[PDB]
Amino acid sequence: GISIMIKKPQKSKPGVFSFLDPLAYEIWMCIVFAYIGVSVVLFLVSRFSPYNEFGIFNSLWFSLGAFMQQGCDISPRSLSGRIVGGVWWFFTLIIISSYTANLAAFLTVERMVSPIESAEDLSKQTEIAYGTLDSGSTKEFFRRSKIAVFDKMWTYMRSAEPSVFVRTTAEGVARVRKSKGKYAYLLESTMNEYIEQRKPCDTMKVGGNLDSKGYGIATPKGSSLGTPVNLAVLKLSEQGVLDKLKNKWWYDKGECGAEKTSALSLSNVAGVFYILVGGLGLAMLVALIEFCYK
């Protein structure tokens, strides 16, 4: 059948925000608003109902001094002001122990998930480009279809430039590799299980069969081989000879087969250096604004 061919899902180009991957994008947002939140409730309990020093500029500095584990300089002295420091401290012992713990889970067990998992997943996007052969059954199949998933998939490659078509099979293979997968070629599914199992192991067959054709041993019209062939192809398929001899040529007489955990590159934590220098440059702009104010 018609099936999809993409590059084996590569590790990453880890974008320079990737430090905050272990927690979700809704826990890091709950922290910031529970940062301001527990800084404020400290401030109310410190100024009102006094025993003081904790201004709203100084109670933010206590809670930044309690989340980054770097300790504090000014301890709360009241029964209600310590319970603010009591449950914000236990907050940061869990969220830092859930940050270290989940980041030790990314680096030990690395699983690469594929971007697409169907033809619908290729239809519900514009980021990855398709590709077929220019002249053949794979070409003609989308055009005469009316099933509306394979019709949306035809309207794209009808128009979209640069040219999504190829002129030979080895072209379409070598437009996935050399293309850092953005190009999903559409083979017949017997060649997808061939190019995957031949070196360099770079491409895999995702999803299932779109169409369903069938290869057949052909005999000329009204020949007397027409009956024994037909009753032997069925006989081989039941005696497991058309499968044992499929495992041999695609897989067994084949490549790939069935880690090391390298050190963290600069690029993984490179998002923090940019926040560091940008956190400096914004402070030196506060230096000039404070000085001109004086």
Binding site: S212, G214, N230, L231, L234, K235, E238
Partner: protein
């Protein structure tokens, strides 16, 4: 669907009503086996499974 009761060699069921006269077509899920394409003819498969 079909059987070959080996004590009596009688086709049963759907193939047993299409060998033994009283049907002309069997548009239904018949699995293309070997023992069935010796007594009745099948089309090319409409559904792969």
């Amino acid at each position: 669907y079909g059987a070959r009761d080996a004590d009596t060699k009688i086709w049963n069921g759907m193939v047993g009503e299409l060998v033994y006269g009283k049907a002309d077509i069997a548009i239904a899920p018949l699995t293309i086996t070997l023992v069935r394409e010796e007594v009745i003819d099948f089309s090319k498969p409409f559904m792969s499974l």
